[PDB]
Every structure is written in structure tokens, then in C-alpha cells.
Amino acid sequence: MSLQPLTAVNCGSLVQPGFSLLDLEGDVYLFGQKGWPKRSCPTGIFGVRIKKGELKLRAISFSNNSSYLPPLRCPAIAHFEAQDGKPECYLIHGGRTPNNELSSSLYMLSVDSRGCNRKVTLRCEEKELVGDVPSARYGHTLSVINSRGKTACVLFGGRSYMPPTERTTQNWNSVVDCPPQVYLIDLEFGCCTAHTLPELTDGQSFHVALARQDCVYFLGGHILSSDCRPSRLIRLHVELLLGSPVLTCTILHEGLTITSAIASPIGYHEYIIFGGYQSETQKRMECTYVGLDDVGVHMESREPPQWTSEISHSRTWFGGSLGKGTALVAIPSEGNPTPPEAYHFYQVSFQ
Amino acid sequence: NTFLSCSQYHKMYRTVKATSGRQIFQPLHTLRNAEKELLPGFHQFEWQPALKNVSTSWDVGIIDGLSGWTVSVDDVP
Amino acid sequence: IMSISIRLEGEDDGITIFQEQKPNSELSCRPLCLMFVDESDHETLTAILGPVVAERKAMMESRLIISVGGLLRSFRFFFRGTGYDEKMVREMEGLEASGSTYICTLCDSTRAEASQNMVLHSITRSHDENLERYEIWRKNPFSESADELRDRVKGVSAKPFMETQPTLDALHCDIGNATEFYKIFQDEIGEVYQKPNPSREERRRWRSTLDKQLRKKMKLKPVMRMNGNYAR
Ligand SMILES: [Zn+2]
């Protein structure tokens, strides 16, 4: 629980406030970049390295038989555990296009090989969605669950632009909470199913969810319709029966008022929720620790690593999970004139 | 056509009206609504068929371009 | 507004009613939107231009009815996106901006090939077909590699969103030919066919004697970069 100011040696204008961090098979891969893929790296995905505070960003590449992806803005992420038939998978859907727009498409990502010089080759595959597909949305959450004993995907949350009939020029950029009906997805086949929940009467965004032993727990839960940040955690439990995937839900009395959190898994289930915003302008300073058992969530705090007055006074911030007690956060920087490297970086560590 | 200010125009007008006036230029207030013919949002019209995805009010003038961007600092600012 | 004609009653083309007499002069350049934003950051530019694009698109479909001459009269429209500089055109039509191996916004020949042949070419680039090529780029239905796919779509990476007419600009083609002749004059003041690789010092020196020559004769001091008047 201590921070360290970094400096990106170069390439300090390709990161945008919304983006994703995926640690898979060693190195960390950043997804989502300001502007369309520059011809430096038509991949649109960067390898990251942290050497003596220096932030180094390398170019990556996919296969020939791989699909090429638009750099989604703030998609949903799922770390599908390494198993048959294809270990290990990263399921993404569906973010916002840098050409400002949504894609209800769903991508599956894996690693291919190495090096031959420690270089990393990747592979992307779209999936047609037999559904009952959820329309395009963003800020939602996708998760993986393993129920008796097969693997399925749970999709819930997020908002979207106006319904297409109500798409109004002067209400175009506005966005309303997508209706609260969860979606169950088999990775194969891409048969998507919709399901209703009589207790989840409202959509929500940016609520970091967690999955464990085919049981899902939603923390956070900021909502537009009521301007509320209901701390109350939401648990649900699914049993994958053929062909009725039975589903149940339940309210928890207490969770936490977190919005767009950064989740670092340190142990197999020792998680720390790092930061976000506790109120509409009041960012969350403190850290929080959650132990995740079949008993459930178990809550505690840690010491908040002292934020230098720069970040502690900065209006907004964000970051991602470098993983394993380590995470990255960024600060919108000022200047006269702008450097224009307007983002400082704090590498934060647990223990 | 010559980039004058309000106070500019009022001084000029008041002056030229004092001497040999017989007011000539027009006061400010009258222009302040006389221009409304030349701005947008004055003239009746419609479309057949009606336009898709456009609120069909024909009188709105200057509009902020954000289009009701939800100010939520949670999301993209 | 550029031109307006009448098609009624039919059986003919559009009888030209009024064509504008001098559209170049900014006295006819009607502003519609302004954004305190930079040209390059796609995100913000798009998220503000959105409604404009949407309604211009929907505009080609319906027909207009206005009170004019005391009467209710109808209208149709034809839009042309022409007045954009190169960088923006290529940026919004999903090109590799700008001096990459694909140069022409119209003919998809490579750079070096554009030196072998110069005159014989066809204009092909069109909006919808660029959307087709971009869908091919995304789906990758042939499982080709980076460069093979780059070629199969003839270099279309980004999804365009604003449709644009197949034409060039007048002004800054003028400025480009002007700066090209400027460079070649800086070159031929010295020796180039006689000097395989000159150095920077000799380049700036040939520039300096060219500027002194333009000052003594023609009364032309240089400027930072040659605009339209200095080009003329
Ligand atoms: Zn050409």
C-alpha cells in the first residue's frame, strides 16, 4: 500500500481516461487508445513495461487468422479461466468506438505464441450471438461463472444512448440506464439468453462485479435515474440446468458507495478495491479490502497510501489493475503551456 | 458590417440624434428584436415525409452542441 | 449555398434558376457549428458533430416545404462535402494520415508506383465501398496477415463516418505546387544533378541567395510559410 510516481519515457498521448488493462500470461496489455490505430501499431493494443519508474509501451500483433478490433472505450471485461478447450480467454464486449458509437459485437482474446524474441503474438475471434442478444451498451459488466460444472457468462448493467425511436438531435449525446434484464451466454455456442429479475428494478453502470464458484456479487451501483450510489451489495446465484439455467437473486444490507472502481486480485480471492469516486465530486480516497469466500464478502480497510497533494486535490482520476497487489492510476495534469503530457502516473503496490 | 459595440453604437446614435436630429439611426433596443428575422428560428416550414430522429419544433434558435451530455463525471467528462 | 435549379414539370433536366456569382469570397460562408476543441482528437470532434451528420444524412430523404413568394413550395437537396483540407478528409474517410504508402484519396496506387505512371488512372474511391472495405478489414474473412490485408483493402484502417465528395481542394493544391517549386528552386540555385547528396548548410545557403534574389528583383521578402498570395 505505497505509491510511486512514474514517467512515461515517450508515447504519453495515446492513453485516454477510459481504457482497459488485461494481464494475461506474464506481461500486461493495455487496450483502448485515443484516436484510431496509428500506423505505428495497426494492432491497437500495447504491451506495457515498468522499468525504474520508466513507462515503456511496445507494439503487439495478432495472427493472420485473427480478427482486427476497434479500440473500444470502456467495455466490459471477463477473465475466462484457463481451461479446455482454449486456455486462457479474455472476453470483451462491447465498449464505445473512438468514432463515438457503440458496438454490440463480442470479442474473445487469447495469446498465440512467443517470442521469438520475447515478443508476444495474440489472437482475436468474434462470436455471432444467437439471441436475445443485449443491444449495444457500455459501462456494463461481464463475468464468468462455473456451475455444475460448465462455464457460462453473465452480462448485466450499463447504459446506452436513447432508444432508437427517441433518438433526438438535441438529446443525441444523452444516455439512459439500460433496462435491468441480465443475459446468460455460452461461449459455445454463442446462444445468448435474456432473463428478468423482479428485485432489480433499475439499470446501473460502472458497478464493479465479482464472480466466485458460480455466484456473483455486485458492489458499487451508481445510477443516473435517481442520482444515487446505493452501497447495498447485490448477490445472485445461478445453477446451470439443461436447458433451464435457473437463477436467483438477493439483497445485501451493506456494500460500499464506490463508482468505477479499480479491483486488484492479490490472492486467489484477497481483493482490494482501490478507488473511484465516493460522491458526485468527492472522489474516494481510502482503500478497501474484501475477502471472498462461500461465506461471502468480508469487509475491512487498509491504510490509504498518502496521496500527494497533486492527486489528493485533483478533480478526477482513474486507473487499472496491474494485478497482484500492483495497480496503476493516472492524473489529468495541468500546464502553461501544456507539456502536453497531461497525465502523471502513480504505480501503487499492496504490501 | 463594421464591428461596432453596443455602447459604441449607442454613443454614435445619441450623438447624431442630439445634433440636427431628427433621429436617423435606430436605437439599440429596436435592433435587439429587429434582427430576429435574420437569425434562425423564425420562419414556418415542414418536411414530407417528416424527418427522422429530429424534434420537429421549427422555432428554436441557438443551441448548445453537447446535446444533453449527462454531466456525470463518473463517465467521460 | 452554391446553386439552385428547377426540375418541374419534368421531361428535361433542372433549369438553372440561380447559380452563385462568387462563392469563394467568404462573404458567403455560413457558419453552423463551433467547438472549442482540437482538430485531431477524434473522440470529442465526433461526439459533437454527431447530430449534424445524422440530420444531414436524413436530409437527402425527405423533401422541404417553405413559405416563399407567398406560396407553399417544395424543395429537394444535393449535398457535397468538398471544402475540407487533405488531412481532415483522409482522417474522416478512414485513411492513413497522411503521407503514407497510399496517397491519393481517389486512385489507390502506391506511392512509388505513382512515379512510374502519372496520368493514366481511374477515380474509384467511394463512401459506401469504403464501408465495405472497412467491414472486410474488421471481419478479416480471408485470414490474411497485416500487410496482405492492408493491400486487400488498399489501406483502409479506420471506419469513416462523414461522407465526402471525390474531389480535391483548390487552395491548398496551389500552395503545395507553390512550395514544391519553392523547394526545387532552392535546389537548382545550386547543383543537384551534379550533387548527389548536399548538406543542410548548402540547402539553407541556396535558400538565402534565393531570398536575396526575390528581394532585389520582384521585391519579395520571404515569409515563414508561403500562403495563397505569396503563391500567386
Ligand atoms: Zn490517384
UniProtKB/Swiss-Prot annotation, chain B:
UniProt similarity note: Belongs to the RAG1 family.
Functional summary from the UniProt entry: Catalytic component of the RAG complex, a multiprotein complex that mediates the DNA cleavage phase during V(D)J recombination. V(D)J recombination assembles a diverse repertoire of immunoglobulin and T-cell receptor genes in developing B and T lymphocytes through rearrangement of different V (variable), in some cases D (diversity), and J (joining) gene segments. In the RAG complex, RAG1 mediates the DNA-binding to the conserved recombination signal sequences (RSS) and catalyzes the DNA cleavage activities by introducing a double-strand break between the RSS and the adjacent coding segment.
Protein name: V(D)J recombination-activating protein 1
Organism, scientific name: Danio rerio
Compartments, as annotated in UniProt: Nucleus
Subunit description: Homodimer. Component of the RAG complex composed of core components rag1 and rag2.
Gene expressing this chain: rag1
Lineage per the UniProt record: Eukaryota, Metazoa, Chordata, Craniata, Vertebrata
Tissues of expression: In the adult, predominantly expressed in the thymus with lower levels in the pronephros, mesonephros and ovary.
Free-text note regarding domains: The RING-type zinc finger mediates the E3 ubiquitin-protein ligase activity.
